[PDB]
Design a protein around this ligand. Sequence first.
Ligand SMILES: [Ca+2]
Ligand SMILES: [Ca+2]
Ligand SMILES: [Ca+2]
Ligand SMILES: [Ca+2]
Ligand SMILES: [Ca+2]
Length: 316
Amino acid sequence: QVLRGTVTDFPGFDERADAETLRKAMKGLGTDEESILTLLTSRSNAQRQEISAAFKTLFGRDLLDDLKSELTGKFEKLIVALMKPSRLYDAYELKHALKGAGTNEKVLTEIIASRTPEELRAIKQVYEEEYGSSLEDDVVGDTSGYYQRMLVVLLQANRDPDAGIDEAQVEQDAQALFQAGELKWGTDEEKFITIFGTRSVSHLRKVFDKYMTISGFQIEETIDRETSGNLEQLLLAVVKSIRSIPAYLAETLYYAMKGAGTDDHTLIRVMVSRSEIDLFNIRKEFRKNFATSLYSMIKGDTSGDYKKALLLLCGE
Ligand SMILES: [Ca+2]
Ligand SMILES: [Ca+2]
Ligand SMILES: [Ca+2]
Ligand SMILES: [Ca+2]
Ligand SMILES: [Ca+2]
């Protein structure tokens, strides 16, 4: 399918002109957040990096340090995130879910399950450069059990490529998965980890069909998203990503705003990271699955300059 983002290079871009607009906006008493916000959400990530350089050439000041001393709250978290160069974002997000006591298993599952092999290679590469330690050793050092192993398997970015679809292997995997599901994924974990983690995307889709034409239940129906289980949360995220990455991220966003509070960190992470990849496709899945639009949900769930920036990122 064709992936379309909501943010694209801004025509007639001038990094010096933009460097100055931002300077006048930060300069002196009071800040013009309305100006920063509108400027930053209509320039691609590559352009924001160019604005930063020109800002440094013209004033000898660091644009980001400035935005941080001037901005505050979720609006700042959102601006700081947009500034992060595209290639460094998932790696940064991953270093901070692992870093320190505990682990944000949520981010680890979300990024590793929804990212393609090419994306994971580049992430593994950029991560070691930036942080010195390899992603795989930090994951292995923070996670455990079959959760760790499944994450490590996916981290190898070695899913079979899509080619000849043997129906003998398909039915064999469907049966296996069926029986592992009936056992609530608590037995023979080794066998299913290999199927979910190394089988080609087109293969696993036939497996998901067959599996249901064996049980009458979609494979996800054998797992409760709401409840615990790191390994199950991962199996759920993988299944959904194998079906549709936008749909999976379309839902991750939904559950970020659905409830008593708002998971602004997820809301910010998915909005920013996918803005130039498939945020558009994500918007289309959100509407068709949740009967409402992302725009309209973000508008009612967030407030202020923060809300305005998300809405401009969202687009229509
Ligand atoms: Ca100021
Ligand atoms: Ca003000
Ligand atoms: Ca501040
Ligand atoms: Ca830790
Ligand atoms: Ca809410």
